[PDB]
Amino acid sequence: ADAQLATCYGPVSQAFVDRAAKIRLLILDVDGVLSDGLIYMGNHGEELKAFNVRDGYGIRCALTSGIEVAIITITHLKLLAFRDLTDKLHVRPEEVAYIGDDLIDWPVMAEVGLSVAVADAHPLLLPRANYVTRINGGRGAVREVCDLLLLAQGKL
Amino acid sequence: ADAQLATCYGPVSQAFVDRAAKIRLLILDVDGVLSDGLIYMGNHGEELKAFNVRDGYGIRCALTSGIEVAIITITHLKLLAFRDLTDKLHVRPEEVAYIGDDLIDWPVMAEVGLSVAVADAHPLLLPRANYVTRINGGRGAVREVCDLLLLAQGKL
Amino acid sequence: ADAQLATCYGPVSQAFVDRAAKIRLLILDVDGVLSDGLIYMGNHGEELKAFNVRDGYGIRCALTSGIEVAIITITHLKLLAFRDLTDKLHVRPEEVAYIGDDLIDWPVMAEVGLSVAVADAHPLLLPRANYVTRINGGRGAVREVCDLLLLAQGKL
Amino acid sequence: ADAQLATCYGPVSQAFVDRAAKIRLLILDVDGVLSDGLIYMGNHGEELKAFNVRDGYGIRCALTSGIEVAIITITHLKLLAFRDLTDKLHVRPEEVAYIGDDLIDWPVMAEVGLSVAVADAHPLLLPRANYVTRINGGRGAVREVCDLLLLAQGKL
């Protein structure tokens, strides 16, 4: 049924594997998923964010492996924004994965075939996602999902 | 009496719940509560701080839920500064919450209905606060309090 | 003899207390003691460091409590640099504390009455110091020492 | 045979010691080995990285101890880039050490006498390296290797 398949990130269920093997669009939040969740503001009007290098490679593998990559506000940049893309790309909801970190992402993660919460996501989001990563946001959590998707699709 | 009520952050006492259910003004330090406690100084005269994105949403929920938000030196920006606001807003001390991280905040946290110390606050502050968060400063500790206040007030 | 005295940072020996109660000059490295040990370099020629706000208050308490504060390269800014100050301030070596993080600090920490290694100092430095802090560098380790010195001197 | 030799970083095998005692060229990735793996991008076109101060000293010891230091894209700056240097420096592969953090480094770490993965390297890289550090990238992992190499060569 839905027992454990070993990965280098720890075991996953067959349910998760059957979910990830249908995925063709990966939707990613910025703050708390690709970034540490911090915005580095300065007195001189600066605003910085920190993104992880291992993530950008994970995104490139997925992109060249046939997984589109969208950054909810190169790749393609609430409830309705998700619907505009899936129609614009003609992708079915079962075929979408979503990585978020805040409770304000739940209405979209409720429609996607594979909802993902980063390890240090908002506590109220963790029981809702199909999968909770082992890596924190901005620390390679997106790479973790990217690797698991390619594994589930026999591409890695 | 004052037994445990489960939350997604861990249990809290009924005492804490009875405290948080009266709160209408949340007072927040900057350094070590909304920031990592670090100031990023550069050779070219820059000074930066890092604030957490999950916190800003927690502040917005509280603000739209009827909790004012003040940043001890949009929102409203020692012992006397606290008294000027509470008079200016006509709020009673029992109805104020305070999140700090340093021992130099104790005289104000001693007057408020709900004193809060962040998880990694100064060690000498932790035994004094009504509540110690589970999240570090600049990592979502303010969001933790914001969520607990809305829960205690039946707004979440 | 030299048994344990409880502090809010954990126990210390009477030896440490008898050491800290003679201290009138605290010497502090920058990198890895007041900073996270990181230098934030940018393409546009920037160089940044991150210092902790709880540390600056610890330094101010010590300064107003009668402990001078020197930053080995407001306060007063290898083996010989230490000797120039102690002569210039007429302070005796038994009366000096030193917080470092790297093995290149050992010849000076060998002469001071109270040698201190931060919790995440270079592994080869930890067995050498009179005291190892509980807080990492750039995370309040200097505040920890500052508080312990004032306690040992009955000023806190 | 290949039993444990105590170090201040924890035990290492004699195999590792026999490996490190032949090393004359240390090759280092940037992202995730000397840096936290983060790139700090700002709205105003900035890009920053954070390097560790304890690492730069480790590199200087190695350099003055007879270990060249190369930064795969002062020191000397995929599979073919490695081969160009080893020919240009007339160094034999058994005599090269490589510190990486991502699976895209494995073809080079497969040819070197001492392959090293940082503690928080990509999970798929850890079973491949001759050695896994105890320190994370950008936190002194390069210093750890630098110290172990000098120990293995009787220079420390």
SS3 of B24-75: the string is CEEEECCCCCCECCEEEEECCCCEEEEEEHHHHHHHHHHHHCCCEEEECCCC
Q: Bridge partners of D70?
A: D27, D76
Could you count the other beta carbons within 10 Å of the beta carbon of residue C147?
24
Q: Bridge partners of C48?
A: B42, C40
Supply the Cα-derived Rg of chain B in whole angstroms. 15
Going B9 to B15 to B19 to B21, the CA torsion angle's sign is positive
Largest CA distance in chain C: 58
CB A98 within 8 A of CB A27: yes
Burial call D56-73: b when 16+ CB within 10 Å, e when fewer: ebbbebbeeeebbbbbbe
Resolution of the determined structure in angstroms stands at 2.7
The rounded distance, in Å, linking the Cα atoms of D42 and A140 is 20
Angle (CA) B47-B53-B55 rounded to 5° is: 100
The rounded distance, in Å, linking the Cα atoms of C105 and D53 is 14
Burial call B20-45: b when 16+ CB within 10 Å, e when fewer: bebbbbbbbbbbbbbbbbbbbbbeee
User: Neighbours of C (≥3 Cβ pairs closer than 8 A)?
Assistant: B, D
Q: Is A104 on the interface with B (CB under 8 A)?
A: yes
The rounded distance, in Å, linking the Cα atoms of D16 and B12 is 51
CB D49 within 8 A of CB D33: no
Please give the residue range of the domain that contains residue A20. Answer: 1-156
- Kindly state the tokens that stand for C7: 């502090």
The rounded distance, in Å, linking the Cα atoms of A125 and A98 is 12
CB D33 within 8 A of CB D71: no
Number of domains chain A is built from: 1
Q: Name residues 28-47 of chain A within 8 A of D (Cβ).
A: 36, 40, 45-47
Q: Which residue has the tokens 């895209």?
A: D104
**E-assigned strands of C81-147?**
96-100, 114-117, 131-132
> Do residue D38 and residue A40 have CB atoms under 8 angstroms apart?
no
Task: Residue D41: list chain A partners with CB under 8 A.
Answer: 48-51
SS3 of A60-99: the string is HHHHHCCCEEEECCCCECCHHHHHHHHHHCCCCHHHEEEE
> Do residue D123 and residue A8 have CB atoms under 8 angstroms apart?
yes
Supply the Cα-derived Rg of chain C in whole angstroms. 15
Which residues of A participate in the annotated binding site for substrate? Answer: 31, 60, 78
Contacts of D148 (CB under 8 A, 6+ apart): D7, D9, D12, D16, D20, D131
> Do residue C50 and residue B31 have CB atoms under 8 angstroms apart?
no
